[PDB]
Coordinates of C-alpha atoms in Angstrom, one line a residue:
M1115 CA 94.7 136.9 -3.2
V1116 CA 93.6 136.0 -7.1
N1117 CA 91.0 133.4 -6.7
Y1118 CA 92.8 130.7 -8.5
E1119 CA 91.0 127.8 -9.9
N1120 CA 92.5 124.9 -10.2
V1121 CA 92.2 123.0 -13.4
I1122 CA 93.4 120.4 -15.9
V1123 CA 93.9 121.5 -19.6
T1124 CA 92.9 118.4 -21.8
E1125 CA 92.9 120.4 -25.8
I1126 CA 94.5 122.7 -27.1
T1127 CA 94.1 123.8 -30.9
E1128 CA 96.0 125.9 -33.4
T1129 CA 95.0 129.6 -32.4
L1130 CA 95.9 129.2 -28.4
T1131 CA 92.7 128.3 -27.5
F1132 CA 92.9 125.4 -25.0
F1133 CA 89.8 124.0 -23.0
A1134 CA 90.0 122.9 -19.0
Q1135 CA 88.2 120.9 -16.1
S1136 CA 87.7 121.9 -13.2
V1137 CA 89.6 119.2 -10.8
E1138 CA 86.7 119.4 -8.0
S1139 CA 84.4 117.9 -11.3
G1140 CA 86.8 114.7 -11.1
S1141 CA 85.0 112.3 -9.7
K1142 CA 81.4 114.1 -11.5
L1143 CA 83.2 113.6 -14.9
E1144 CA 84.4 110.1 -14.0
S1145 CA 81.1 108.8 -12.5
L1146 CA 79.4 110.2 -15.7
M1147 CA 81.4 108.6 -18.0
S1148 CA 80.7 104.8 -16.1
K1149 CA 77.0 105.3 -16.0
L1150 CA 77.5 106.5 -19.7
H1151 CA 79.0 103.6 -21.1
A1152 CA 77.3 100.6 -18.5
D1153 CA 74.2 102.1 -20.2
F1154 CA 75.0 101.9 -24.0
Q1155 CA 76.3 98.5 -23.9
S1156 CA 73.7 97.4 -22.0
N1157 CA 71.2 99.2 -24.4
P1158 CA 73.4 99.5 -27.4
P1159 CA 71.8 101.7 -30.1
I1160 CA 71.0 101.4 -33.5
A1161 CA 73.7 102.6 -36.4
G1162 CA 71.7 104.9 -38.4
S1163 CA 68.2 105.0 -36.8
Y1164 CA 69.9 108.7 -35.6
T1165 CA 70.4 112.1 -38.0
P1166 CA 70.9 115.1 -35.9
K1167 CA 70.5 119.0 -36.8
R1168 CA 72.8 120.9 -36.5
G1169 CA 73.3 122.3 -32.5
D1170 CA 71.7 118.8 -31.1
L1171 CA 73.5 117.5 -27.5
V1172 CA 74.1 113.6 -28.5
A1173 CA 76.2 110.3 -27.9
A1174 CA 79.2 110.1 -30.4
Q1175 CA 81.0 107.1 -30.7
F1176 CA 84.3 107.9 -30.6
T1177 CA 86.0 106.5 -33.3
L1178 CA 89.7 106.1 -31.9
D1179 CA 88.3 104.4 -29.0
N1180 CA 84.7 103.0 -29.8
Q1181 CA 83.4 104.6 -26.5
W1182 CA 80.5 106.7 -26.3
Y1183 CA 80.5 110.2 -24.5
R1184 CA 78.4 113.4 -24.6
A1185 CA 79.1 115.8 -27.8
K1186 CA 77.6 118.3 -29.3
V1187 CA 76.6 118.4 -33.0
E1188 CA 78.1 121.8 -34.8
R1189 CA 77.6 120.8 -38.6
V1190 CA 75.6 118.1 -40.5
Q1191 CA 76.6 117.6 -44.6
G1192 CA 74.5 114.7 -45.4
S1193 CA 75.6 111.5 -43.7
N1194 CA 78.3 112.9 -41.5
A1195 CA 79.0 115.0 -39.0
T1196 CA 80.8 117.3 -37.2
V1197 CA 80.9 116.9 -33.0
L1198 CA 82.7 118.8 -30.2
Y1199 CA 83.3 116.2 -27.2
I1200 CA 81.9 118.6 -24.8
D1201 CA 83.5 117.0 -21.6
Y1202 CA 87.5 117.0 -23.2
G1203 CA 87.2 119.5 -26.1
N1204 CA 88.5 117.7 -28.9
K1205 CA 86.2 117.7 -32.4
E1206 CA 86.2 115.2 -35.2
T1207 CA 83.9 114.6 -38.3
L1208 CA 81.8 111.4 -37.7
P1209 CA 79.2 109.5 -39.7
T1210 CA 75.7 110.2 -38.2
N1211 CA 75.6 106.4 -38.0
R1212 CA 77.7 106.7 -34.8
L1213 CA 75.1 108.8 -33.7
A1214 CA 72.8 108.2 -31.0
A1215 CA 70.3 110.2 -29.0
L1216 CA 71.3 111.2 -25.5
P1217 CA 68.9 109.4 -23.0
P1218 CA 67.6 112.8 -20.7
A1219 CA 69.7 111.7 -17.7
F1220 CA 72.8 112.0 -18.9
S1221 CA 71.7 115.6 -20.5
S1222 CA 71.3 118.0 -17.6
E1223 CA 75.0 118.5 -16.8
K1224 CA 76.6 121.1 -17.5
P1225 CA 79.7 120.3 -20.2
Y1226 CA 83.2 119.4 -18.2
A1227 CA 85.6 121.3 -20.3
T1228 CA 85.3 125.1 -20.6
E1229 CA 87.5 126.3 -23.5
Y1230 CA 89.3 129.4 -23.0
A1231 CA 92.2 132.2 -25.3
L1232 CA 95.1 132.0 -23.8
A1233 CA 95.6 135.7 -22.4
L1234 CA 97.7 138.5 -25.0
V1235 CA 99.4 136.1 -26.8
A1236 CA 99.5 136.4 -30.5
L1237 CA 101.2 133.2 -32.7
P1238 CA 104.3 134.5 -34.8
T1239 CA 104.1 135.3 -38.8
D1240 CA 105.7 131.9 -40.1
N1241 CA 104.5 128.7 -40.3
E1242 CA 107.1 126.9 -39.1
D1243 CA 107.3 129.1 -35.7
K1244 CA 103.6 128.9 -35.5
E1245 CA 103.9 125.2 -34.6
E1246 CA 107.4 125.5 -32.0
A1247 CA 104.6 128.0 -30.2
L1248 CA 101.9 125.5 -30.3
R1249 CA 104.2 122.4 -29.7
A1250 CA 106.3 124.5 -26.9
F1251 CA 102.9 125.5 -24.9
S1252 CA 101.4 121.8 -24.6
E1253 CA 104.5 120.3 -23.4
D1254 CA 104.2 122.8 -20.6
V1255 CA 100.0 122.5 -19.6
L1256 CA 98.6 119.4 -21.8
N1257 CA 97.1 117.2 -18.9
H1258 CA 98.6 118.8 -16.1
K1259 CA 96.9 121.1 -13.4
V1260 CA 98.1 124.1 -13.3
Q1261 CA 95.9 127.2 -11.2
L1262 CA 93.8 130.0 -14.3
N1263 CA 92.6 133.1 -14.4
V1264 CA 90.3 134.6 -15.9
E1265 CA 91.5 138.1 -17.3
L1266 CA 89.0 139.2 -18.9
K1267 CA 85.2 138.0 -20.3
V1268 CA 84.5 138.4 -24.2
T1269 CA 81.0 137.9 -24.9
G1270 CA 80.0 134.9 -27.2
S1271 CA 84.0 133.8 -27.5
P1272 CA 86.5 132.1 -25.0
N1273 CA 86.9 134.3 -21.9
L1274 CA 91.2 135.3 -21.6
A1275 CA 92.5 133.3 -19.1
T1276 CA 96.5 133.5 -17.8
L1277 CA 97.8 129.9 -17.1
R1278 CA 100.5 129.1 -14.3
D1279 CA 102.5 126.6 -12.8
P1280 CA 101.7 125.8 -9.0
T1281 CA 105.0 125.6 -7.5
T1282 CA 106.8 128.0 -9.1
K1283 CA 103.7 130.2 -10.0
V1284 CA 105.5 130.8 -13.5
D1285 CA 103.1 132.8 -16.6
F1286 CA 102.9 129.6 -18.4
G1287 CA 101.9 132.1 -22.3
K1288 CA 104.7 135.3 -20.7
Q1289 CA 107.1 133.1 -20.7
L1290 CA 105.6 131.9 -24.1
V1291 CA 106.7 135.8 -24.9
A1292 CA 110.0 135.6 -22.8
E1293 CA 111.2 132.7 -25.0
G1294 CA 110.2 134.8 -27.9
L1295 CA 108.1 131.5 -29.1
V1296 CA 105.2 134.7 -29.9
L1297 CA 103.9 137.9 -29.8
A1298 CA 102.3 139.9 -26.8
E1299 CA 99.2 141.6 -27.6
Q1300 CA 98.5 145.0 -27.7
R1301 CA 95.0 145.7 -26.2
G1302 CA 93.6 148.6 -24.2
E1303 CA 91.3 147.9 -21.5
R1304 CA 92.7 149.7 -18.4
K1305 CA 92.3 146.6 -15.8
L1306 CA 94.6 144.6 -18.7
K1307 CA 97.2 147.7 -18.7
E1308 CA 99.6 146.1 -15.9
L1309 CA 99.4 142.6 -18.0
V1310 CA 99.2 144.4 -21.0
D1311 CA 103.4 145.7 -19.7
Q1312 CA 104.7 143.3 -18.7
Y1313 CA 104.3 141.2 -21.6
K1314 CA 105.6 144.0 -24.0
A1315 CA 108.6 144.1 -21.5
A1316 CA 109.2 140.1 -21.5
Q1317 CA 108.3 140.4 -25.4
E1318 CA 111.3 142.8 -25.8
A1319 CA 113.8 141.4 -23.5
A1320 CA 112.9 138.1 -26.2
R1321 CA 113.8 140.8 -29.0
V1322 CA 117.5 142.5 -27.1
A1323 CA 118.6 138.8 -25.9
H1324 CA 117.8 137.4 -30.2
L1325 CA 115.3 134.4 -29.4
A1326 CA 113.8 132.6 -31.5
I1327 CA 112.0 134.7 -34.3
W1328 CA 113.9 136.9 -32.6
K1329 CA 116.5 135.7 -34.2
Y1330 CA 117.9 137.7 -37.1
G1331 CA 116.0 141.3 -35.5

């Protein structure tokens, strides 16, 4: 009877945080991107006429496809800026001449992607084990429809969330633990006790089975 949210995972970072879009907001973003494309084709901005302050919400021309996206300026350094593509979750450093003022019409809708921390998962000690963990998790969830549950709200940073396969009901983060690819996190929130204990047992099973990072005990 847990109220799962149907999401699509759109971006995964190197610390196993991830960005997810709501499935029922898919048409909303689709419409926005189509209107933004048409707007900036009809009235293309003048390159170099805009420079941002840190925090500005802008239109940014993605270096990959030369299309315009909604973006938050996170850092400005001379001729370049670091931006977050708020509807998808990826970041890049970019010349400021590829930034323009976002028309107030596109600025009111909340970001269509939200960042979360994968609940109770810690990356392994080895660097190559780290890579494999990120590869394995991306293969599991990237671009896929999954069920998300927020486990803990965190003030000032991404909330803790589990991800579940809609068909098998397998907890993806826990599966990473059971496969011996990541470590289980121990923490004290009583509401997280059951999940903490379960992830601990999964880690233990992977240890006994000598899986992956636990190969040489």
